[PDB]
Amino acid sequence: MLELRLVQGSLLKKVLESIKDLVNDANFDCSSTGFSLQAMDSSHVALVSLLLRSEGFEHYRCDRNLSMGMNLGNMSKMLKCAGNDDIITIKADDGGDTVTFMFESPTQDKIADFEMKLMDIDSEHLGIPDAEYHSIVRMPSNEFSRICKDLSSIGDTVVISVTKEGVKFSTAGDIGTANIVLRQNTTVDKPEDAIVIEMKEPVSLSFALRYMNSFTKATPLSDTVTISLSSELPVVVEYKVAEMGYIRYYLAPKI
């Protein structure tokens, strides 16, 4: 059987909000290691990799490795009904066609039971090697979100380039051109100034802002976002899920 009890239910709510607009249907893979997911958008242009480690759950029971195919929008609609302070439990019968989400208030004065139909999904999973990226940008998630929103109002493509002079986000459109250059502050003296730019080799790649903007739906999960770049690879945009996992977005470049 499957029974996963997550005390911080709001994390699951945020995770679903982060992926439902990128992928319509996807499989959630359960194993003794954790609750995960890997799926590409319909265009195979972007990929999302989610992992909630077993250690983050208060109760974790997964008798056998299993996969639950789900309509992400429907799962999100149900999770939207859980309170931000609710303890959420995912229950499933290995030989079942439905999944149950229990929503429990801390005092227990309220217990909700939401049940959803499971669907068969034959999704394509890709093998992703642990590479050492040439440039890595760790910056405030809110700032990354603003940059993508701002640039997308100007053009459709953003050129991200990292050199010893910092990281530049550039776009051009009908109304003109726009670029934003970020540099590490003298010190990390406040959250807004928490920008770390690691440059091993310079990198410059072009990406679709429409996708970048979808990735920013994970902003509420962390105050920080990490962008990893390499000349021969898709960009990786990562948001940590508390201290129990992550959501990693991969986006193929425009060349």
Binding site: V45, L47, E124, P234, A252
Partner: peptide, 11 residues
């Protein structure tokens, strides 16, 4: 030209 994730990593 927009490349694909599959142009980098295979299934």
């Amino acid at each position: 030209r927009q490349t694909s994730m599959t142009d980098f990593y295979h299934s």
